[PDB]
Amino acid sequence: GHMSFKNFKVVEKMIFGRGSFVQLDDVLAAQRKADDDFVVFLVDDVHQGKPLEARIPVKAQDLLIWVNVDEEPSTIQIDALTEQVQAFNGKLPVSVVGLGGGSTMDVAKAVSLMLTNPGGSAMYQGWDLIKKPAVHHIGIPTISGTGAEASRTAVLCGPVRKLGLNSDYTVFDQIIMDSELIDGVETDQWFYTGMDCYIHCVESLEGTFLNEFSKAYAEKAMDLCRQVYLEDHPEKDDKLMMASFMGGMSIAYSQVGACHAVSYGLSYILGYHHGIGNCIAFDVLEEFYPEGVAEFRLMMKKHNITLPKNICKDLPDETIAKMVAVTKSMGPLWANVYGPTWEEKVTDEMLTALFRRI
Amino acid sequence: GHMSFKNFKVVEKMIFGRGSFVQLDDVLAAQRKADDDFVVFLVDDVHQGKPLEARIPVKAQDLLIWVNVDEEPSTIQIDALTEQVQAFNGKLPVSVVGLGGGSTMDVAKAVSLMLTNPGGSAMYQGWDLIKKPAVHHIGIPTISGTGAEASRTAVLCGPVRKLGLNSDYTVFDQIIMDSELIDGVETDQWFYTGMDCYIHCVESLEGTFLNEFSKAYAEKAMDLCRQVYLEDHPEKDDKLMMASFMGGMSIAYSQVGACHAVSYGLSYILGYHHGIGNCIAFDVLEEFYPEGVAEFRLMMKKHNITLPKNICKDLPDETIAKMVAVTKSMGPLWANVYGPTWEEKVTDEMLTALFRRI
Numbered sequence A, B: 001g002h003m004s005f006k007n008f009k010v011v012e013k014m015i016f017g018r019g020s021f022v023q024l025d026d027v028l029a030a031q032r033k034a035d036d037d038f039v040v041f042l043v044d045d046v047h048q049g050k051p052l053e054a055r056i057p058v059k060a061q062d063l064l065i066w067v068n069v070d071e072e073p074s075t076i077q078i079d080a081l082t083e084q085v086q087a088f089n090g091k092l093p094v095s096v097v098g099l100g101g102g103s104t105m106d107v108a109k110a111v112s113l114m115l116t117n118p119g120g121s122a123m124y125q126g127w128d129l130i131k132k133p134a135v136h137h138i139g140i141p142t143i144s145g146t147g148a149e150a151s152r153t154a155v156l157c158g159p160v161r162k163l164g165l166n167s168d169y170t171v172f173d174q175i176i177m178d179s180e181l182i183d184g185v186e187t188d189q190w191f192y193t194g195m196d197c198y199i200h201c202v203e204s205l206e207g208t209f210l211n212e213f214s215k216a217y218a219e220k221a222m223d224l225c226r227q228v229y230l231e232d233h234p235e236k237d238d239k240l241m242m243a244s245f246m247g248g249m250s251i252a253y254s255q256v257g258a259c260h261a262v263s264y265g266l267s268y269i270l271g272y273h274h275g276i277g278n279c280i281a282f283d284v285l286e287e288f289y290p291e292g293v294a295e296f297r298l299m300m301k302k303h304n305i306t307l308p309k310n311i312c313k314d315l316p317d318e319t320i321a322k323m324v325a326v327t328k329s330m331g332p333l334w335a336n337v338y339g340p341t342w343e344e345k346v347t348d349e350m351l352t353a354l355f356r357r358i
């Protein structure tokens, strides 16, 4: 035998450019072989009533689903959506479009997978469980930072917990990166989601699992984040969309760390959304990432960002302990932070003290 | 109608990591459906007698061709190689491997194309002329900087001139980036080929045709080049391989400029190789790229690089004029430098004066 590095599968086709949403209809047309071939549009319901709605190239035969992301995606939701598509028409759609953030894009990835992989989405939560190629699927981010447009995963809250459908088949066939679509995101959520990128970079770049491929992508996306959140460039939306993209590219040969691991306890037990949750966690992690936290804090001041505080002050001991146990279980993240002796530092007590500061 | 941005097609699968050459045999095995399915290895003849030769996973049925790159690739060469493969076996090979620099990788791309596209390689020099998908093809760079592992082109000297087979079908199906394979490149050629990356970045980043996608890739590869040629990092070979890669990625929404346009006259009339030729040209282009040329010159001093000088001092006027006319004809490059009024600055006299300084 020999050791193997990951053979990394990327999004094969991409359009970058402001206004490029207008090209979606042509990309779709190339998949519509028959007159009646149809497309599923999964669209974040934030876009309902906004200028983008009128531009979505929906045909008479197509299925437009408004996705509500008040809660992040779940296996139940995926399974209901996949049955909806199945009841809508006897034919497979020729493409599934995810038009939204990480949540909606992940919904589109997962639906496109479940349309060709029976048994429900929970069954495929894990690594390389998907047996058949997905329906052709297109990702179109309308808020930048998760890198979900680029990744091989779709993160779903299952019967227990948030875990991804990781597979080469998960990857979008096509992405369209049109930063006009993000120009209206509100300041706080713009900050929360873009900090998903920045924080991920900081974590990855301090990790024990890192090569120069991932390092170069993470460095440059962090650089782009600094330009967006500390400077004032006319191309700020294109820069942030590019950062997001580069972040996603960096995932291959890197890992997250202490912020994601903590954030994961907050999300799973207290229902905090992914972006805000990482920001909340990062602000108590100055001992892990002193430079990144200091810079993050200047970024927050620059943009009048106020994080909620005292979230965990009065919670029952038992609820803390549940977050502690979830966080502690994320071995590969803690190994990324501390190396193979991580179990000696990642204690119930050290974690409890972090959560009590949030 | 609407405007369209390019829908950029990238290498779909990639392995990055030192030692990953050992994985080539497994990647090949996945293409060998029948016992007797064969592979073509196109290998730069520099590797003959070197440690790499013994490691190439050549099977009894396979065809190993030593490619001599004393001259850069030509349509005649491509056509002869494609006929050799055709005479070797009645079946199509299941993959074509290019193991070498830009020259060898481009030979592999072009052979893999010609095996499924009859009529000779000259006929396909241009844009999107290829009618049928290529044979599965794998690029494995053994000297870093051209970005040819990433690009949609294969540059061949045709009946006239160097022009590429540009097509989405040209793109490698798989790249393997193993910087162990570049650790032995000699100082001067290491410099010439890595400067292909750096100079390309400088040109692109000053261009009128540039978006933030290409800008971020070009910036980061230029950053990596600076780390390699001005600093002294233990990971210098991984950094340069990554720079090369990122350079290739930047091509989509950018263009070259005055260095490539000049260099092209030198190559076509005087037979200068691509890397050295760009270095030779760049050293007279301080008025176009003052900062890049100054830095390039410190890089040369750091590595005891001496460029040949007085190349054109005594040439016949007529030979200068041929280089001038070739260089002047590269409109899109000159438009990248000066914008749509470029014809008023790009004169016979201005170009002649540059060439007489080389």
Ligand SMILES: NC(=O)c1ccc[n+]([C@@H]2O[C@H](COP(=O)([O-])OP(=O)(O)OC[C@H]3O[C@@H](n4cnc5c(N)ncnc54)[C@H](O)[C@@H]3O)[C@@H](O)[C@H]2O)c1
Pocket: A044, A045, A046, A069, A072, A073, A100, A101, A102, A103, A104, A106, A142, A143, A144, A145, A146, A147, A148, A151, A152, A153, A154, A155, A181, A182, A183, A184, A185, A186, A189, A192, A193, A196, A274, A275
């Ligand atoms: N697949 C992956 O690799 C990956 C990576 C990181 C995170 N994630 C997942 O991504 C999800 C979070 O994604 P996210 O941070 O983009 O947030 P999101 O998709 O939940 O959206 C956040 C909010 O912004 C709103 N929004 C979206 N586009 C907008 C626009 N143009 N204008 C105004 N508002 C807009 C949404 O309606 C929602 O209120 C989580 O479920 C997380 O698990 C996935």
Ligand SMILES: NC(=O)c1ccc[n+]([C@@H]2O[C@H](COP(=O)([O-])OP(=O)(O)OC[C@H]3O[C@@H](n4cnc5c(N)ncnc54)[C@H](O)[C@@H]3O)[C@@H](O)[C@H]2O)c1
Pocket: B044, B045, B046, B069, B072, B073, B100, B101, B102, B103, B104, B106, B142, B143, B144, B145, B146, B147, B148, B151, B152, B153, B154, B155, B181, B182, B183, B184, B185, B186, B189, B192, B193, B196, B274, B275
């Ligand atoms: N397809 C593209 O997008 C693209 C882009 C830029 C340039 N190009 C083309 O690339 C070609 C030049 O490529 P290049 O600069 O890599 O040089 P190359 O392929 O010609 O090789 C240069 C020299 O280095 C030697 N070499 C290669 N690997 C080595 C190793 N491991 N150790 C020692 N010596 C080694 C070669 O034998 C040769 O002498 C030109 O034909 C140019 O037109 C193509």
Ligand SMILES: [Cl-]
Pocket: A066, A067, A068, A077
């Ligand atoms: Cl829904």
Ligand SMILES: [Cl-]
Pocket: A271, A272, A273, A276
């Ligand atoms: Cl929340």
Ligand SMILES: [Cl-]
Pocket: B066, B067, B068, B077
């Ligand atoms: Cl040859």
Ligand SMILES: [Cl-]
Pocket: B271, B272, B273, B276
């Ligand atoms: Cl030469």
Ligand SMILES: [Zn+2]
Pocket: A146, A196, A200, A260, A274, A278
């Ligand atoms: Zn995240």
Ligand SMILES: [Zn+2]
Pocket: B146, B196, B200, B260, B274, B278
């Ligand atoms: Zn070049």
